[PDB]
Structure 1
Amino acid sequence: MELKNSISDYTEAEFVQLLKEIEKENVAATDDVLDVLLEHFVKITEHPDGTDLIYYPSDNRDDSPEGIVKEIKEWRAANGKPGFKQG
């Protein structure tokens, strides 16, 4: 197992792909994979709003993976915390 524990463990491209899986499982017949991916997303982002980031986007941004990534990046910088794996 090649486990990712924090956001620095990720690159903006790998995180975008994790968000695409979530979108894929959101439309899936069952929520079994979805429930686990949501828990992982909440744990690696450390953002207080949790899954609200996915389900309730602020009016300005959209709920695309890129818009969510931009939201996280901005909030990590604002709070002086490390972001993704820079590349």
Structure 2
Amino acid sequence: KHSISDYTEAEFLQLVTTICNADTSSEEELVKLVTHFEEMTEHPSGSDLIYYPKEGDDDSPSGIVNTVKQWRAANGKSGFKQGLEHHHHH
């Protein structure tokens, strides 16, 4: 919600997959999610991460999460909230 450290990597993958598949009820909603993605990543390429990947970049949902994760790591910015895996058994 407020910054990318409010997302676990899995939640961020669900967000990116939503965008990539255009899983919205309107173009307005898709444009809003793209803008939110740009604001979360803080990447200078903005929506180009999704729609105009740099030659040799992986533009699958998982590809894009990875590019974000790594670019944030390298530029000394904060990363994903750690997830809490559900365990079915002791």
Q: Compute the TM-score of the two structures, normalised by the length of structure 1.
A: 0.84
More divergent stretch after superposition (34-43 vs 51-60): 51-60
- Which residue, 48, 58, 64 being the options, matches 2:54? 58
How much has 1:23 moved relative to structure 2?
A: 1.8
Partner Cα distance (1:86, 1:29) in 2: 30
User: Looking at CA atoms only, which structure, 1 or 2, has the larger radius of gyration?
Assistant: 2
TM-score, with length taken from structure 2: 0.82
Residue aligned with 1:60, SS: coil
Residue 20 (structure 1) aligned with residue 4 (structure 2): no
- The offset of 1:73, in angstroms, is 0.9
Report deviation, 1:59.
Answer: 2.4
The amino acid across from 2:9 in the alignment is E
Q: How many residues align?
A: 83
1:5 counterpart residue number: 2
Counterpart of 1:45 in structure 2 is 41
CA RMSD, aligned part only? 1.7
Give percent identity, aligned residues only: 59
User: Is 2:63 the counterpart of 1:67?
Assistant: yes
- Which 5+ residue runs of structure 1 have no aligned equivalent? none
Aligned-residue offset at 1:86:
2.5
In the alignment, structure 2 segments of 5+ residues that lack a partner are 84-90
Q: Is contact 1:53-1:68 (8 Å) kept?
A: yes
Deviation at residue 24 of structure 1 after TM alignment: 2.5
SS at match of 2:22: helix
> How far is 1:9 from its partner?
0.3
